[PDB]
Structure formats: C-alpha cells, structure tokens
Design a protein around this ligand. Structure first.
Ligand SMILES: O=C(O)CC(=O)CCO
Length: 257
C-alpha cells in the first residue's frame, strides 16, 4: 500500500485500485471503495447489458441517426451518418474507439441510464450510479455520486459479464474479444503487465483529470485477474498522465507475484 501512496504523491492524484486473482482469491486493494467518475469505463458494462438483452442476430439491426445525434467525440459514428450502423458495429466503436455517440445509441437501446442502473442492481452492483449520456456523464464534481462507481464495483461488474454466468459463453467471448482489441489503452494497464500477459480493457477519461482503466488480464498460464485502476485529481481542468495507471498496474502484478 505504500507503493500506491508514493504514486499518489508522484502523480498528484488519488488512486482507486481493486484487483482479484480468480484462481486464488488473493486481492490487491487501495481506496477500493472510494468513488470516482466512471467516465467511458461505463461503456463496457453498457455492452454487457446489451448482450444480456439482444440475441446475436439482433446485433445485425441497423440503427440510423443524424448529424444532430452526434456529440463531441465520434471517431466512427460521424463517418456513417448517411448509412447508419448495426448494433454490433456500434458496440465495436464504443468499446474499441470509445465512440461517445455509439455509447449513447447503445444506451437508448437498453432503456437509458436508469435501465442500466436497474440492470446493474440486479447483478448485485449497488454502487455504480449511471444518470447521464456522453459526454456530460464525464463531468463529476467533488462529493457527487452521479455517474460514479468504485474500483471494487467496476471490477466486480466487469467480472460478472466477462467471466461469470451473467452472459452465456459465446456472448462472454464476444465481449472479451472486443475488449482484447481495444485501441485506447496501450499506455495504461497494457503498459504495466509483463510480456505474454493478455489484456482486455476499457479506458475512461473525465473531469478533474480522471483517468481510468478496467480490465480482465490473463497470465501465460492460470486464471484471469480482474483489475480496476481509477484516478482523479484536485483541479477541474487537470491533465492526467497515463503513466500513473501503467505504474499502478506494475505494483498490482508484483503484489500478486
Ligand atoms: O479513454 C477514453 O475512453 C477517452 C478517449 O478519448 C480515448 C483515449 O483517451
């Protein structure tokens, strides 16, 4: 725990860590129950719920939308206004590019932030508190619980969908495969794990320099480790440093070693 404290000093940030080795039940925790804006990490759990509700052929359904529907960060969706996108294509864009419009379109499909909350409550997550769409959800002020969760809750809900029986295996594999092919976390959890370790992650960035990564990680042999690494800073306009998360992950790996 002192190693984490020193990272908090080095990077002038608050750190939230929960890691579980599913083979041994050993954990690594640090402010595990402290709330942080979840930011785009919520995209992973939103797709988990979508997969609970949609069949695979349901995902071939084309969703149409307009220039008006576009928000601030639409790397994929802004390129397909004219033709629309399938739910499967939207899930891809949301998870692997962190496309905000894609998240919003998927979120509508599942009944909005309240339905997402109800669904998370049903799987035993009493902490995660979705209220808004992207990008407004990313802006959480100190003391607020709206659009927040904790390291422990995020890791546990991700584990529920990716590793447990909340999804049947083919849908688990689908979620895992998208997250394995995430494009946005090269400097985060992925930069903190030894060679030959496999990573399936979703990143997030929000106000107060919030910088998150949640993941399932697989050692060369043995069971997966579930990990959430969350962070925030004291100023609203603060910039984050990805190295904080990479270094935190290294501590986690060492501790489980
Ligand atoms: O991490 C996120 O989900 C937000 C992004 O802008 C992608 C890279 O930061």
């Amino acid at each position: 725990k002192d190693d984490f404290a020193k990272l908090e000093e080095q990077f002038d940030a608050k750190l939230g860590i929960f890691a579980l080795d599913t083979g041994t039940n050993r954990t690594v925790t640090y402010r595990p129950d402290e709330r942080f804006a979840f930011a785009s990490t919520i995209k992973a759990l939103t797709v988990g719920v979508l997969l609970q509700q949609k069949s695979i052929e349901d995902l071939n359904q084309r969703i149409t939308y307009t220039r008006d529907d576009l928000v601030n960060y639409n790397p994929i969706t802004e390129k397909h206004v004219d033709t629309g996108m399938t739910l499967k294509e939207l899930a891809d864009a949301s998870l692997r590019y962190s496309d905000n419009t894609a998240q919003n379109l998927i979120l509508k499909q599942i009944g909005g932030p309240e339905s997402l909350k109800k669904e998370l409550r049903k799987i035993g997550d009493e902490v995660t508190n979705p209220e808004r769409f992207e990008p407004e959800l990313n802006e959480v002020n100190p003391g607020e619980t709206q659009d927040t969760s904790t390291a422990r809750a995020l890791a546990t809900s991700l584990q529920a969908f990716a590793l447990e029986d909340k999804l049947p295996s083919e849908k688990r594999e689908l979620l895992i495969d998208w997250m394995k092919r995430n494009t946005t976390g090269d400097a985060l959890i992925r930069a903190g794990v030894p060679e030959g370790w496999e990573v399936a992650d979703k990143t997030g960035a929000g106000s107060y320099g919030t910088r998150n990564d949640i993941a399932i990680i697989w050692p060369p042999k043995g069971d997966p480790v579930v990990l959430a690494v969350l962070s925030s800073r004291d100023k609203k306009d603060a910039k984050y440093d990805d190295k904080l998360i990479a270094e935190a992950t290294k501590v986690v790996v060492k501790a489980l070693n």
